[PDB]
Amino acid sequence: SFSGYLKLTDNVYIKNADIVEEAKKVKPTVVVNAANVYLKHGGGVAGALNKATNNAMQVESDDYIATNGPLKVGGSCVLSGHNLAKHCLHVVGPNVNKGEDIQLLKSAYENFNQHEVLLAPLLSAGIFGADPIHSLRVCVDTVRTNVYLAVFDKNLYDKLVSSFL
Ligand SMILES: Nc1cnc2c(c1)COCC2
Secondary structure (H helix, E strand, O other), rough: OOOOOOOOOEEEEEEEOHHHHHHHOOOOOOEHHHHHHHHOOHHHHHHHHHHOOOHHHHHHHHHHHHHHHOOOOOOOOEEEEEOOOOOEEEEOOOOOOOOOOOHHHHHHHHHHOOOOEEEEEEOOOOHOOOHHHHHHHHHHHHOOEEEEEEOHHHHHHHHHHOOOO
8 A cells, every 4th residue: 555654634634646656656546646627748757747648648648638528627537547556547637837726726636536546646646837835725725535745745745744834
């Protein structure tokens, strides 16, 4: 199972880890991708997860978008986890660098409640531009299922743990 996680609440855990390396080690039922509405996995967590699948995640995602159209900001879709997990839950957090409503971050985290346990990044953090301390607060106040957060950046991980209320 998951190892080396610091317990933050009854259901939220956190670790300084590369989510691709974490997924390969664990092979969780669900890995969360920090997706955009088009499922274009170019950079950040999405680019790293997609690159780990040898682009199979992007090919599957383009077929999904061709059939269904784009996701909503705050929405999600369940696709294959390829070599990383049983499933990938592609969740769209608001991208602050696109003027997207930061209030949609709570809606985005609500998608996690449809899964009993997940390996996930902090939504809207990184290249999405939101404050990761705020994202962690919304995560613990919204997600009721068991979430194992992987924070790539060690300095950000330390800041998140040391400032956690
Ligand atoms: N937060 C976060 C967790 N893991 C990863 C990243 C970000 C980006 O590089 C790939 C692995």
